[PDB]
């Protein structure tokens, strides 16, 4: 414990602030909109409100598609 004063002495600067933004708070990861429990895991390890779920609404870097059973040239 200790209250630490040194320069600047000068100080206008101070309020009380929510926790650091987490890197999901259960919010999709696409529109950043409060998903909670309608929240959708993609394979590309992010989290969608199942409306950007789909890898062609949130241009999902992924290639699970064309990886797996799916000899799609490309
Ligand atoms: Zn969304
Ligand atoms: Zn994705």
């Given at each position: 414990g200790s209250?630490?004063?040194?320069?600047?002495?000068?100080?206008?600067?101070?309020?009380?602030?929510?926790?650091?933004?987490?890197?999901?708070?259960?919010?999709?990861?696409m529109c950043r909109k409060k998903v909670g429990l309608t929240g959708f895991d993609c394979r590309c390890g992010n989290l969608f409100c199942g409306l950007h779920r789909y890898s062609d609404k949130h241009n999902c870097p992924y290639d699970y598609k064309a990886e797996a059973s799916g000899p799609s040239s490309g």
């Open positions: 209250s630490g004063s040194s320069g600047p002495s000068s100080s206008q600067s101070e309020e009380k602030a929510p926790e650091l933004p987490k890197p999901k708070k259960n919010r999709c990861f």
